[PDB]
């Protein structure tokens, strides 16, 4: 029971996916980093490892891009919520100006009376 | 049980205050608007109403400014969370560049071998 904008309730969904993904993202990244360090043209399992590091690379690019998508999507929800808050703020600041300006009009009117 | 950044969990607090305030903010605003319409220098209760509309005005400016404060505070939490997400995104995009660039190095190495 957390009270939030709906756009922020929606953000909680792809953010959860984003958080749960993080393990696999960093894991696949290191699986590529290690494979990159071991790859040696002088070796006898080189051609096999060369094909493998391509599989690992593509698979790492896929999971990362999958994370980027959810990340970019979640960012737009944050930007949307931020715009809404800036609008409410802008309107509240408008109400403040009107009150002061109206009070100026009342004071002027109260002066010409005397 | 909503899974969110801590900065967004913190945002939920002053946003709740912000939502609960909204009734009193709009109510005091209309209490001023009505009082402004009724105020008449020709009237016989004018001087009394003139003092009253000043009380209402100040009280409306206070509750609005009180809402603005919580609003500006909540906005900075949104901006903070957004910056964090843009960083994670920027790092994920860095991992993507490195993988592609490393794979370029491996391919070049695999070519000079032949």
């Amino acid at each position: 029971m957390l009270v939030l904008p709906q756009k922020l309730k929606d953000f909680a969904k792809d953010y959860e996916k984003l958080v749960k993904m993080h393990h696999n993202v960093c894991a696949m990244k290191m699986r590529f980093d290690k494979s990159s360090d071991e790859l040696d043209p002088s070796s006898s399992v080189y051609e096999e490892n060369f094909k493998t590091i391509s599989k690992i690379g593509n698979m790492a690019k896929d999971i990362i891009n999958e994370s980027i998508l959810k990340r970019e999507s979640g960012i737009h929800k944050l930007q949307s919520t931020l715009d809404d808050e800036k609008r409410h703020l802008d309107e509240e600041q408008n109400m403040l100006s009107e009150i002061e300006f109206v009070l100026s009009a009342k004071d002027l009117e109260h002066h010409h009376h005397h």
Side-chain angles (χ1 to χ4, degrees), chain A:
Chain A
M1 231 310 99
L2 277 160
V3 34
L4 286 162
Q6 186 56 42
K7 226 63 170 50
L8 244 41
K9 292 195 217 283
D10 303 339
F11 172 83
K13 296 167 186 173
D14 49 30
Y15 178 79
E16 178 172 6
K17 290 168 170 288
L18 221 41
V19 169
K20 198 188 180 190
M21 281 185 65
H22 184 68
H23 167 54
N24 304 347
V25 172
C26 285
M28 202 66 201
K29 168 63 181 179
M30 198 185 193
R31 193 142 170 85
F32 175 84
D33 289 338
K34 290 179 177 298
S35 182
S36 175
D37 292 337
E38 301 159 51
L39 190 65
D40 176 31
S42 298
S43 162
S44 336
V45 293
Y46 170 62
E47 292 290 343
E48 309 141 55
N49 280 337
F50 175 77
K51 296 175 57 182
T52 282
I53 199 189
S54 296
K55 265 205 182 69
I56 299 182
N58 295 336
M59 217 156 306
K61 291 191 291 185
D62 286 16
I63 180 116
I64 288 174
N65 272 313
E66 182 179 341
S67 183
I68 288 179
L69 247 46
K70 288 290 182 177
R71 183 134 272 144
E72 291 176 327
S73 164
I75 283 181
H76 195 233
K77 292 185 179 60
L78 294 178
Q79 276 281 359
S80 172
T81 306
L82 186 61
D83 295 341
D84 288 11
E85 287 298 296
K86 289 184 178 181
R87 288 190 188 271
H88 294 153
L89 178 69
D90 182 81
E91 167 69 4
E92 286 174 332
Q93 287 168 336
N94 285 329
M95 294 184 180
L96 211 59
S97 293
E98 181 186 359
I99 290 174
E100 274 150 354
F101 190 66
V102 164
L103 283 178
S104 294
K106 300 311 181 182
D107 284 6
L108 182 65
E109 170 181 73
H110 186 270
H111 193 77
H112 284 178
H113 206 238
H114 301 1

